[PDB]
Structure 1
C-alpha cells in the first residue's frame, strides 16, 4: 500500500486542484506598519525588488 497511497494522494490532490504558486509569484498574507509577509516566492533572493500592484516595489529582507 505504501506506494499506491502516495499515488492516490497525488490523484486526489489533482482532483481538487490544490496547487502551489509559481516560483516567481506569491501572495500577501499580512500587512502592518509598512511591512508585508509574502507567502510563496520560492525564487526570491535576499535584497530583491518585489513588484506590488500599483507599480510599487518592496525589498525582500527576511
Structure 2
C-alpha cells in the first residue's frame, strides 16, 4: 500500500535478509588494471596523496578521489594485480 516507511523499512528488512553489506572504510577492491594505473572501488576514507597498500608488499598512490572510485598508480610491477583483490 502507501508503505510510507513500510517500503522504507521493508527494503531495509529485505536487504539485511539477503545479506548485502557495504565495504568497511579503509577497504576497497581493485576494479580495473591497465598500463600501471589502478581504479579502486570503496575506500570511503582514502585521502588524496595517501599510500594504499596492495596485496604483496607494494603501494599505490591515490591521485583522484573520484565520485565513485579512487584512481591510483602502482609503485612497482603492476603485472600481477587482478580485479577483485
Please say whether Structure 1 and Structure 2 have the same fold, judged by a TM-score greater than 0.5: yes
- 1-structure distance, mates of 2:28, 2:4: 33
Instruction: Determine the C-alpha separation between the residues in 1 that align with 2:28 and 2:56.
Output: 16
Q: Provide the rounded CA distance (Å) in 2 between the counterparts of 1:6 and 1:14.
A: 12
Superposed displacement of residue 26, structure 1: 0.4
Give the TM-score normalised by structure 1.
0.97
Q: Any stretches of 5+ residues in structure 2 without a counterpart? A: 65-85
Structure 1: gaps (5+ residues) = none
Q: Which has the higher helix share?
A: 1
TM-aligned CA deviation for residue 29 of structure 1: 0.5
Q: CA RMSD in A?
A: 0.5
Greater relative contact order structure (CA < 8 Å, 6+ sep) = 2
Measure, in 1, the Cα distance between the counterparts of 2:4 and 2:41.
31
The number of equivalent residue pairs is: 62
Measure, in 2, the Cα distance between the counterparts of 1:3 and 1:16: 19
